[PDB]
Design a binder for this molecule. Sequence first.
Ligand SMILES: *[C@@H]1O[C@H](CO)[C@@H](O[C@@H]2O[C@H](CO)[C@@H](O)[C@H](O)[C@H]2NC(C)=O)[C@H](O)[C@H]1NC(C)=O
Lengths: 49, 49
Amino acid sequence: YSVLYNFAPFFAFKCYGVSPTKLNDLCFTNVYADSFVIKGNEVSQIAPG
Amino acid sequence: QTGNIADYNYKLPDDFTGCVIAWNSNKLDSKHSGNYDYWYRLFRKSKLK
Ligand SMILES: *[C@@H]1O[C@H](CO)[C@@H](O[C@@H]2O[C@H](CO)[C@@H](O)[C@H](O)[C@H]2NC(C)=O)[C@H](O)[C@H]1NC(C)=O
């Protein structure tokens, strides 16, 4: 998760389900990652509900 | 119990004695268009005694 932490300015880091700090040891099998490009305000508009 | 809420906010003692009362209260705790007056801390340095 260093690349997620150090690489790129990571302008958006907000999330509500699982803490991004107590995550290095936490371990799953599959993760659904989707990539797309938007402007500044849509990044903020990205949210649940 | 292990997790986030039971690990940072409220930890029941291992040698607990007594009773636990549970009942769903949707009308008295939720309202239309969101109700996030309540707060639970999922970020803590360590587990809670
Ligand atoms: C509340 O007092 C307790 C003393 O028992 C302390 O809480 C611990 O603080 C250490 C660091 O000083 C942490 O590593 C532990 O994880 C803490 N444990 C708990 C259960 O909080 C501290 O002095 C006070 N805690 C806070 C958050 O101010």
